C-alpha cells in the first residue's frame, strides 16, 4: 500500500463440489493458502463437498476482507484455489446509509 | 415440535450406537433426537454417505447435529476405520466443514472423547445436505420453535396459588 489512507482488500476462497473438479482445476496436490501482513495472519484450505445447486452451481466461494494500513505489505502464498483481487477498494468520506423500499422523490 | 428427518442408511452402518454415559431404560442409550453412526464391523472404514433433508413446513425449523472427537487412535480406527474423515454441511444459506480430531482429554462422566454440537435455522423451502465419511452424529428428528415465551432463570420455588 502506497497511499496516505487505509485500503480495503477483498479476496475469495474456492470450495469445489467434486473431486474431479478439484483435480481438473488445481490438480492432485495438497492445497494450502496463507495470507500474511504486519497486522493480519490467516490460513485457508479448500474443502470438497457435495452441496445443492444455487444459481445452477454447487461449489461455493467464501469471501474474506481486511483493512490494510498505509505503509503495510500483504503477502499471499497459495497452491491453488485462491481467488485473487485484481483491484482493491478504498472507502472515501462519510455517508448516510438508508435501507428502505419507498421510492425516491427528487423534488422534496 | 419434533419432526422426523427420514434419513436412511445402508446395511454397512450401525445407527444404534450406545454408551454407558447416557442411561435411559437401565441400559446403555444415547440422545433421543440424535443417532450415532458407526461401522457395523469393528474395523472397517465408514462408507462415504450423503443425506438430504428438505423442509416442507410454512415456518422455519431448527436443526442440531454433532461432531464426534475420539480419545484415541484405536477408538477412531474401530469406529470409522483408517480413512481420512471429512464432514461437509451445505444449504442455500449455510456452508461449513468439520474434521474429527483425536486427542487425549480427562474423563468427564467417565468418558474422554467429546462431541461438539452445532445448530442452524433452515428456512421454509430450503434443502440441507450432509456429506460425511465417518464421525457424524446425525439428527433423527429436528426441532421447530413455536410461539413466544418468557424465560426465567431463578431458584425460588413455584407457588401455583398467587
Amino acid at each position: 500500500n502506497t497511499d496516505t489512507a487505509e485500503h480495503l482488500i477483498m479476496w475469495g476462497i474456492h470450495h469445489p463440489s467434486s473431486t474431479q473438479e478439484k483435480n481438473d482445476l488445481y490438480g492432485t496436490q495438497s492445497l494450502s493458502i496463507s495470507v500474511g501482513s504486519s497486522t493480519y495472519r490467516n490460513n485457508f484450505v479448500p474443502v470438497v463437498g457435495a452441496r445443492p445447486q444455487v444459481n445452477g452451481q454447487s461449489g461455493r466461494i467464501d469471501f474474506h476482507w481486511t483493512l490494510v494500513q498505509p505503509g503495510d505489505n500483504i503477502t499471499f502464498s497459495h497452491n491453488g484455489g485462491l481467488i485473487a483481487p485484481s483491484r482493491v477498494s478504498k472507502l472515501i468520506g462519510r455517508g448516510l446509509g438508508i435501507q428502505s423500499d419507498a421510492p425516491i422523490d427528487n423534488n422534496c | 415440535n419434533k419432526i422426523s428427518t427420514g434419513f436412511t442408511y445402508g446395511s454397512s452402518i450401525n445407527s444404534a450406537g450406545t454408551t454407558r454415559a447416557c442411561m435411559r431404560n437401565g441400559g446403555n442409550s444415547f440422545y433421543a433426537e440424535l443417532k450415532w453412526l458407526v461401522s457395523k464391523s469393528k474395523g472397517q472404514n465408514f462408507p462415504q454417505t450423503t443425506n438430504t433433508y428438505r423442509n416442507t413446513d410454512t415456518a422455519e425449523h431448527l436443526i442440531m447435529w454433532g461432531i464426534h472427537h475420539p480419545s484415541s487412535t484405536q477408538e477412531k480406527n474401530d469406529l470409522y476405520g483408517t480413512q481420512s474423515l471429512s464432514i461437509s454441511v451445505g444449504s442455500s444459506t449455510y456452508r461449513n466443514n468439520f474434521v474429527p480430531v483425536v486427542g487425549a482429554r480427562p474423563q468427564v462422566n467417565g468418558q474422554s472423547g467429546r462431541i461438539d454440537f452445532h445448530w442452524t435455522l433452515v428456512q421454509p423451502g430450503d434443502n440441507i445436505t450432509f456429506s460425511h465419511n465417518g464421525g457424524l452424529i446425525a439428527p433423527s428428528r429436528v426441532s421447530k420453535l413455536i410461539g413466544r415465551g418468557l424465560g426465567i432463570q431463578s431458584d425460588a420455588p413455584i407457588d401455583n396459588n398467587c
Partner: protein, 171 residues
C-alpha cells in the same frame, strides 16, 4: 392555583374575542367591552417563548446499527432491542412529564397574569370602589367611558373622587 380562573370567576366570557383578559362595563351610557393589552401580550410572549425553546433541536446525527435486509446475530440483536426499548421507555416517560408539567405551568401562569392584572386594577381603584368578589367592581359613585379608558390607560386618579366616595358612604 390562584383563585381567579378556577376560583371566584365562575364563568368565562366566550363573547370576549378581544383578548384573554378584558373589561366589561355597564354604566348609564350602556354596556361596553374592551381588552387589556399588557397582560394579553405578556401571556402571548411567554407562550411563544416556550414554543420557540421547545421546537428547536439539533438532533445529533445517528446511523443504522441494525440490518433491515439480513439477519443479525441473536445475542447482539437482543442487546440492541433491549437498549432501544429502554431508550424508548425513557423518552416516553420524559415526554409525559414534560407535557404534563408544561400544561400545568401554562394554565397557572395564565391564572397568575389574570390575578396580577386584577391587583393592578385594584391599586388603581384603591379607595373609590369595592370588589364584590365575582370579578366585578362595585363603583360607589360613577365611571364614564373616558373614565373606563383611563382605567385601561392606567391613569385613573383616586384623589379626585376620594371625598365624594367618603361622603356617599357616610351619608
Amino acid at each position: 392555583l390562584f383563585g381567579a380562573i378556577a376560583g371566584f370567576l365562575e364563568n368565562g366570557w366566550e363573547g370576549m374575542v378581544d383578548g384573554w383578559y378584558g373589561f366589561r362595563h355597564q354604566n348609564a351610557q350602556g354596556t361596553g367591552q374592551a381588552a387589556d393589552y399588557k397582560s394579553t401580550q405578556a401571556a402571548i410572549d411567554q407562550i411563544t417563548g416556550k414554543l420557540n425553546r421547545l421546537v428547536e433541536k439539533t438532533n445529533t446525527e445517528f446511523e443504522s446499527i441494525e440490518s433491515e435486509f439480513s439477519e443479525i446475530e441473536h445475542q447482539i440483536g437482543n442487546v440492541i432491542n433491549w437498549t432501544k426499548d429502554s431508550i424508548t421507555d425513557i423518552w416516553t416517560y420524559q415526554a409525559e412529564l414534560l407535557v404534563a408539567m408544561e400544561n400545568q405551568h401554562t394554565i397557572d401562569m395564565a391564572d397568575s397574569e389574570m390575578l396580577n392584572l386584577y391587583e393592578r386594577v385594584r391599586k388603581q381603584l384603591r379607595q373609590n370602589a369595592e370588589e364584590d368578589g365575582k370579578g366585578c367592581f362595585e363603583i360607589y359613585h360613577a365611571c364614564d367611558d373616558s373614565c373606563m379608558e383611563s382605567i385601561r390607560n392606567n391613569t385613573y386618579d383616586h384623589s379626585q373622587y376620594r371625598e365624594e366616595a367618603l361622603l356617599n358612604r357616610l351619608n
